[PDB]
Amino acid sequence: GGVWRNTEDEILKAAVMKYGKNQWSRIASLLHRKSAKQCKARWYEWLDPSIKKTEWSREEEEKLLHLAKLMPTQWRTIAPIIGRTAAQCLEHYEFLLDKAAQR
Amino acid sequence: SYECKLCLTLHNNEGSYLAHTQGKKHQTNLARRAAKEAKEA
Amino acid sequence: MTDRYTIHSQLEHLQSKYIGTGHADTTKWEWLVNQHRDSYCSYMGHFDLLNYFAIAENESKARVRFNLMEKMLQPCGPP
Amino acid sequence: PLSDEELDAMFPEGYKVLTGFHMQTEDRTMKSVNDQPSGNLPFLKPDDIQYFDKLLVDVDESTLSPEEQKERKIMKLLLKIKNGTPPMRKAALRQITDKAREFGAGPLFNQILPLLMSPTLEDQERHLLVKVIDRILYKLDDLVRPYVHKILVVIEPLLIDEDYYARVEGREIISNLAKAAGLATMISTMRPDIDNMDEYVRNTTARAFAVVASALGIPSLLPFLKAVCKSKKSWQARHTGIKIVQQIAILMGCAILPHLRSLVEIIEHGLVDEQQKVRTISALAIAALAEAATPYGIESFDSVLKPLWKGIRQHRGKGLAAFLKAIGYLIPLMDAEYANYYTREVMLILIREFQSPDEEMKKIVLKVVKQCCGTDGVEANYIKTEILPPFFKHFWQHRMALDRRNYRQLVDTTVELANKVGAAEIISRIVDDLKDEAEQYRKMVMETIEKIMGNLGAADIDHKLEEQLIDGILYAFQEQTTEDSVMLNGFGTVVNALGKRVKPYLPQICGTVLWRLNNKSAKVRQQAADLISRTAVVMKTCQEEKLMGHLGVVLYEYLGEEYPEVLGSILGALKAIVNVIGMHKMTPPIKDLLPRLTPILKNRHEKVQENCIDLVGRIADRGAEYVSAREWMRICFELLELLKAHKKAIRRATVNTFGYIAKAIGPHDVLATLLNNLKVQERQNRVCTTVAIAIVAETCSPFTVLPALMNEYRVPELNVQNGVLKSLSFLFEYIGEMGKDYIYAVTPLLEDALMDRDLVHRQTASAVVQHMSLGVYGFGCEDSLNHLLNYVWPNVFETSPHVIQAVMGALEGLRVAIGPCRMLQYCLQGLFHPARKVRDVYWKIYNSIYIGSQDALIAHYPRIYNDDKNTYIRYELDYIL
Amino acid sequence: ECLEKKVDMSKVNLEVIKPWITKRVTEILGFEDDVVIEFIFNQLEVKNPDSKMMQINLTGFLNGKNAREFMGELWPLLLSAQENIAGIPSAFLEL
Amino acid sequence: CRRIVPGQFLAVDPKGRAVMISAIEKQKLVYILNRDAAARLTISSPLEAHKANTLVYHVVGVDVGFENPMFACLEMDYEEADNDPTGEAAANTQQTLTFYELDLGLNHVVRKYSEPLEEHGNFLITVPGGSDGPSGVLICSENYITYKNFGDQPDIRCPIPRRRNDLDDPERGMIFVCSATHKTKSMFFFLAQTEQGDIFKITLETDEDMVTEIRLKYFDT
Amino acid sequence: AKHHPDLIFCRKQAGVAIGRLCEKCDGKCVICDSYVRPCTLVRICDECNYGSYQGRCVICGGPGVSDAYYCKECTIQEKDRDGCPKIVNLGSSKTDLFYE
Amino acid sequence: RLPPEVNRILYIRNLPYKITAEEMYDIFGKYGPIRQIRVGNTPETRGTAYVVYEDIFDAKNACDHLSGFNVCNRYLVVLYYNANRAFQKMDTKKKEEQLKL
Amino acid sequence: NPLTKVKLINELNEREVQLGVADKVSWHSEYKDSAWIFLGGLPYELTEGDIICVFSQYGEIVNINLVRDKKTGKSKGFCFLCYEDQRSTILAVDNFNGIKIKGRTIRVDHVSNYRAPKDSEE
Amino acid sequence: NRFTVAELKQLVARPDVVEMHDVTAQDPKLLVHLKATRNSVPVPRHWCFKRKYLQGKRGIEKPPFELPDFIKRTGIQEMREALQEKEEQKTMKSKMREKVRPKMGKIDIDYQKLHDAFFKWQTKPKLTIHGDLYYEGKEFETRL
Ligand SMILES: [Zn+2]
Ligand SMILES: [Zn+2]
Ligand SMILES: [Zn+2]
């Protein structure tokens, strides 16, 4: 399932703050439901402090509109290129700007 | 069990307290207590 | 005739069959007349309270029994 | 065939009338429509997207929004209950039971009722829907009066359902709806379901009349039955009313007897009607009333025997069978001369109707033979000359053992036939049937043998018959297929009736067992071990202990199994060996048997755990000297992991094993183990060691567990404090009168428990004070109880059910120990308090004290002075001598 | 209110009262039943009946208004018949 | 010593088949007495005679010869006395003698007869019958003794004799305290006693099975 | 019982019918649901002990093995001299477990 | 053949909004005769239709071979409506013999 | 009651196929040496030829017996059919039970003793 | 319909108990008579409060428990604290080692001292009368 509520998310933040970065079984040994891989997925998806999960701008959108036309797929390829780096916020921006261009 | 003292609120486990740092911000409502402590900024 | 008076017995939450208990909106005269009937049944149930009440007057036992029996209907008075 | 009027009367509103080729694919206009609605709540099936179609669009409530959406959020509730996760189910159920007065009766019932009309349901879904129905019946009293018929046409096929639990639930919900809606609404509702052409709804409506008559009593709607049984326009109404009488008589047992005569005076207007069905069901109603009476009212059926006699003389067919059922049920109610005359001049009809081909008449005469031969009338040679030879000729077949109502009735008649005639006369006629190639027929013969030999005995069986029955039951034991245990109890009853007379049979049977105990390991091994556990008793009473010593060292190491179902029977056989034989004289001694039991203890199968810890408890109270004193300390840690087993027999035996362990090796080392079992986070592991703290408190002497139990409250954890309080509760509950010295020691703990902020400490402390008040009653310890009730009494105001029933138990326990006077003084100046929330609770506390001890309050009442009109002074106690 | 002057069914006949009640229930609900005629029959079998229970059981079938005038017509005929030693109401003594 | 639970008054059939224990209010319990083949007493389940809002003044057993046993008791309804505040409804709520017949064939208790009293009685007296005499109950009341027996026998009333000019009667009544039944195997009499100690010799003499008249006389002090 | 509050007792008059308990509920009290200190036999009515309902357990309705008892805590509180404590209904327990 | 299935009905979900009248008549008269259609007014039911026929085999031909068929670019699904309720029962109809059979 | 014996004889065969009963003790060794079968619930429009045509699938009936009434009637509903072999009666009671011909359903049972004019249950 | 606290104070012979909520009862005279009866205790003060009577005890941290002297003179407290301090230092390897290879004789004090402490040396605690009802604070009013 992986509902990933905030009470486990802040514990995972404290566990990354104390132990380390490539140290995952020792911090997944204290969550009662999750393994190392799903914690890796959320921490490289939502809990890294370099993730710009808000403040959508103008320059990155006009960058990605003729970058999602170079390749229609491969959103995780262009995720270090944009700098948004969440790899799912780009999909939300793409479908939202295509809903706004159709309406 | 855990307790926030200015909050006067209970928390059953650890993550119940350490997610209570963003909601019902009385930590900015201690500005009135700081103004009572010192009349100037 | 009657109008909207059809309240039958209802959900048996506790089956309060015991008379003299009372409920939340019980008035004063109800629990007082149950108190006086309970006192009269305590008088006639015990032989000794009957003896103590038969010492003062010169009445017999059955006279005091029938007097305290006929005073079970309306001991206090009209509502 | 439909017209437009019926067509728009059927549908609801909200509608109006009015090789090949290859090119490409193209970019669409985002065809991603919401096929499944906006969330995760359940999954939605394709048959549920008609009734639950309306959540598929997002509401966003504006400009299309009356109050009505609040009365149809219940669509989402039924969605989240019917296919959702059980936390979501119970959340939606509590929410709809809290707002059932707010939703109403219109939208709620017209969305619930057509859901169960669909033919694609599930039994769990129907159970959840009737759970919604009877949990909204508690809140919707006196509001469901027009909607009775639409409920019943949905409910009714639950009464004829195949499973028994759904029938019980249907009877309960129709009884609750009858108590909610009254009587005249039910009669005015279910009246046009009598003249209907469908026999399903007519039979089930008659059953509905029967269950509402059992709910609301007989003479409230007895004029309805008297009305419907004597109308002459169609025979269906009289058939329905006599069917109502029949299901009333078979539904409620003996409370129909005081209203028997006023019910039976109806029934003689039948039996002479021109319809065969009406006469047949009238005979069935007389039979049902005779079965219900048992044996009262024989002078009330006196107007019934003459048309029954005329019908068994002149009529034949199913009417003869119903008349014979009625007479055979009436004759046990009757005095000896008249019942003997009705018995001796009916057996010719029974011998004539033994040639009947139909199975139902076979069942009827099979029930008639039971009750018509048991009192005084028929003798031995009469039956064994002409009644039983056609009985063994025509009824002991294979088709009658298949139907269970015919399977049980044959043996249930054969029991009374063996009571009347004898043992070997029946058995020696069916002893050769134990070698048949049919399993169910041999099971019927085995049930016949076990019931005859358990009721009568075995003295009538001679030496010319016992080897036949022993060889037959051994051959039946060798070739059984199913996992039934009726043959096991049959063999046990046979060997218990034999006793000493089975002495030239035990080597053959035990050799058959010892060869049988391998048998491919295709799960035929638990039967041999259970057979040893049954034959453990009879070999000690036959003076045989050498073969016990032979098989003890066999079952000592046939417990190295991988099958738990075999290992449980092995442990049960070894348990029976340890029971029937003295423990210090067994060839697998306790010195090396319990260490072989210790790896078996780490098996998480419930039967293995049960038999293992029962044998461990038998060793712990009768063999505690065969160890090195280190084993009872290393198994009590494993007995912590032996918990959280869901049978309640393991969890009630293991605390006794803890108690006898502490009786063996002292209550100072297992004590720290039982206190370390109090930080688990899981239930069924902290209360099951709480009981173990109680058992170590009560088996060996006190003052060995109490200082550390006082000490553990200083540990700042919730679970250990709740555990020590509940252990004090079970402690005083188990000791009773021995708490007269320890009340003053735990009173400073109970004042801190009742002083504590959490309500769990206060409800456990109320349980402690309750069990203490029930323990020190009559000993002169009323001061500490009056101290603790001063802290119990502010906890009355809590609204949680567990804490209010805990403090109510504490109040009704302290009612007797310190006296009803202090309880009444605590009740005073709180009776007429204007806040209703304290008022009704103090009145019901006064009701509990009033019903608990009424006369003790007579000396405890205060004085109430007179008003202007009435006399409120008890003048009798006022004067003196 | 008016249904409380206590009665005694031993002072009244029964077979002269049944076709009048049959004609009245023919007038009220339009057609003919036989279960309600036997309802009135079985509730007038007892010597001390309950008029309020009769009113509830006839309010259940009917609208609620028809049972009012039905009781208000069925009651004074029973009173006028039980005051007489014969047991016939004034609607049938004259006609 | 409650109002609800029985124990206050007791009655038994003189043949020894049933026994009724009775409270003041709302319940009267009936046990059926039998004997099985060890010459041993057996008692069945308690039968119910519940009657809510009803007082019980005194219960007695009626002697019947191999008939369903009957228990006579004085009952009084008080719901119209408590629901009406006018006071006069509590003045015309006179006593009702009620007969409870135990059908041993049907195993229940039913209210068979309930006849009112224009006077107020305190306790009752069993009259032996069957093949002995006019089986019934005698009702003692203030200045009166009453015979009632159902069916055809009317209410025979006899005023209680007072003394000549004794100085104890401003307005007072006069009741009994004792019954003292006796059967001398030729006739049967009652040595009744009033509250002053005057024994009354009550003797029934009937020409038919119907009662003709009752009579009594001063016996002793 | 006290564990499931939706269970109601029969509460009618008690006769001479001795109550029974099954092998799963042996030793259990009816009111307080305890195991220790038995004092008083259980008397139930004739309607709850009739026909197929004889030899039947009080709580679960299974086949009875041992006799039923009251505790001394129910004895001195006189919860044995009330109506017959036969559990009639069965709701939300051992019913939905059959469907699961 | 098939008793336990109600007929004379067909439920249509995910209908295009551009239906003036004609395309439902074309599709549902291509397969045979028709009784009528029902078009909703609620913006949920706008795009959800009922249709009643005159023949059973035409309804089977629609349902067994129209599931998963592509139309104007909002693909539809078919179901069987369950007739369970009404709003007013009809009365005072004569329906006499009238010398017909 | 008139057609629940169809369900009873069907549940017998369902219990036989559920418990796994071999053919030596599957209810047909008790009715040996008899090719007679009883019919129940036949409509009144059936002649003897149509009964022969509908029950000659597993073998021709050697001896037919319809219940023709004396003077005023034509039929009652019962029938006796005597085949050649007893296994034909086995297959007829196992296969021709539960079917319907023009409305009312029919039932097949065994006779095993002798033909009777009226003893059975209508 | 409801006479106020003025007449309900003037008519009653004991006016020192009547409150402002006593007017809104259904029979105030017998209410203030049972408020002036001899040995009754009052209703606790939280029928009108909204704090559930103990949820205002948030920030006050109390000591866990004060043991009495006849338990502290047995030596169970020091041994219990010593074994807890020994147990908190253990890892799961040791807690599984002495689970299956246990050591005994840890406390092993005696049998007679507990007998003499709970039977001979029994200390009578400080109890109170029936009229001492428990309100919210009740320990910060030790000034009396
Ligand atoms: Zn049980
Ligand atoms: Zn108990
Ligand atoms: Zn019962």
Q: SS3 for D572-608, per residue?
A: HHHHHHHHHCCHHHCCCCHHHHHHHHCCHHHCCCHHH
Nearest chain B residue to A15, by CA: B15
- Is D597 domain-assigned? yes
- Is H8 domain-assigned? yes
Q: Which residue has the tokens 């009267």?
A: F28
**Deposited experimental method:** cryo-EM
This PDB structure is determined at a resolution in Å of 4.5
* Contact indicator for D594, D660 with CB cutoff of 8 Å: no
For residue F91, the tally of other CB atoms under 10 A from its CB is: 11
Helix axes E18-29, E35-43, angle to 10 degrees: 140
Q: Between chain H and chain I, are at least 3 CB pairs below 8 A?
A: no
What is the span of the domain harbouring residue H8? 3-82
> Could you tell me if E28 lies within 8 Å of chain C, comparing CB atoms?
no
For residue D280, the tally of other CB atoms under 10 A from its CB is: 22
* Contacts of residue D26, Cβ cutoff 8 Å, sequence gap at least 6: none
Ligand nearest to the CA of G76: 2
Q: Which residue has the tokens 């006190």?
A: D702
Q: Which tokens belong to B3? A: 């307790």
* Half-sphere CA count of H90, side-chain side, radius 13 A: 11
User: Which of chain E's residues have a Cβ under 8 Å away from the Cβ of D227?
Assistant: 34-36, 38-39, 41-42
* Contacts of residue I20, Cβ cutoff 8 Å, sequence gap at least 6: D481
For residue I118, the distance in angstroms to the closest alpha carbon of chain D comes to 10
In chain C, which residues are followed by a C-to-N distance beyond 2.5 Å, i.e. a gap?
Answer: none
Nearest chain D residue to E63, by CA: D188
Nearest to D671 by CA among D650, D631, D629, D700: D700
Nearest to D495 by CA among D549, D453, D440: D453
Task: Kindly write down the DSSP assignment for every residue of D343-383, as one continuous string.
Answer: HHTTHHHHHHGGG---HHHHHHHHHHHHHHSSSSS--HHHI
Cα torsion angle, D62, D67, D68, D71, sign: positive
- Is D211 domain-assigned? yes
* Contact indicator for B7, B26 with CB cutoff of 8 Å: yes
- Is J140 domain-assigned? no
- Domains identified in chain J, total number: 2
User: Which of chain C's residues have a Cβ under 8 Å away from the Cβ of J26?
Assistant: 25, 27
Residues D662 and D702: their CA atoms lie apart, in Å, by 12
Which CA distances in Å does D692 have to D647, D842, F179, J140? 17, 37, 65, 39
Instruction: Based on DSSP, count helices (H) and strands (E) in chain D, helices before strands.
Output: 45, 1
* Ligand 3: centre distance to CA F28 (Å): 19
> Could you tell me if F86 lies within 8 Å of chain D, comparing CB atoms?
no
- Domains identified in chain D, total number: 1
Q: In D24-142, at which residue ranges do the beta strands (DSSP E only) sit? A: none
Nearest to C38 by CA among J31, D844, F77, F25: F25
Q: Is D257 close to F2, i.e. CB distance below 8 A?
A: no
Which residues surround the ion ligand 3 when the cut-off is CB under 5 Å?
G 10, 44-45, 48, 84, 86
Any idea where the domains of chain G sit in the sequence? 8-88
Q: Is C73 close to F195, i.e. CB distance below 8 A?
A: no
Task: Extract the annotated binding site of G for Zn(2+).
Answer: 10, 22, 25, 29, 32, 45, 48, 57, 60, 71, 74, 84
Residues E37 and E68: their CA atoms lie apart, in Å, by 17
Which region holds residue D831: left if phi is over 0, alpha if psi is between -120 and 50, else beta?
A: alpha
Domains and CATH numbers, chain E: 1-94 (1.20.1390.10)
Residues F127 and F199: their CA atoms lie apart, in Å, by 18
- Is J77 domain-assigned? yes
* Contact indicator for G45, G18 with CB cutoff of 8 Å: no
Nearest chain H residue to D58, by CA: H44
Which CA distances in Å does H32 have to D440, H3, H29, H51, H54? 58, 22, 5, 13, 9
Q: Which residue has the tokens 């509402």?
A: D212
Which CA distances in Å does D605 have to D576, D608, D650, D687? 20, 5, 11, 21
Q: Which tokens belong to B31? A: 């500005």
* Ligand 1: centre distance to CA J119 (Å): 42
Q: Is D864 close to J38, i.e. CB distance below 8 A?
A: no
Q: Which tokens belong to I107? A: 């039932």
Q: Between chain C and chain E, are at least 3 CB pairs below 8 A?
A: yes
What is the span of the domain harbouring residue D774? 40-862
- Is D762 domain-assigned? yes
Task: Extract the annotated binding site of G.
Answer: 10, 22, 25, 29, 32, 45, 48, 57, 60, 71, 74, 84
Instruction: Based on DSSP, count helices (H) and strands (E) in chain B, helices before strands.
Output: 2, 2
Which residues lie across from G87 on neighbouring strands? Answer: G9
* Contacts of residue D16, Cβ cutoff 8 Å, sequence gap at least 6: H38, H39, H40, H41
> Could you tell me if H36 lies within 8 Å of chain D, comparing CB atoms?
yes
Residues G57 and G69: their CA atoms lie apart, in Å, by 12
Residues D611 and D618: their CA atoms lie apart, in Å, by 11
Instruction: Indicate the SS3 state at residue F28.
Output: strand
What is the span of the domain harbouring residue J91? 59-127
Residues I54 and I66: their CA atoms lie apart, in Å, by 15
Candidates B16, B18, B20: best to mutate against A (most CBs of A within 10 A) is: B18
* Contacts of residue F199, Cβ cutoff 8 Å, sequence gap at least 6: F191, F192, F193, F218, F219, F220, F221
> Could you tell me if C4 lies within 8 Å of chain E, comparing CB atoms?
no
Any idea where the domains of chain C sit in the sequence? 15-79
For residue J31, the distance in angstroms to the closest alpha carbon of chain C comes to 10
Alpha helices in D623-717 (DSSP H): 631-635, 638-641, 650-665, 670-676, 687-698, 706-711
* Contact indicator for G99, D127 with CB cutoff of 8 Å: yes
* Contact indicator for J64, D716 with CB cutoff of 8 Å: yes
Instruction: Indicate the SS3 state at residue D496.
Output: helix
Please say whether the structural domain I2-122 has been given the CATH code 3.30.930.10.
Answer: no
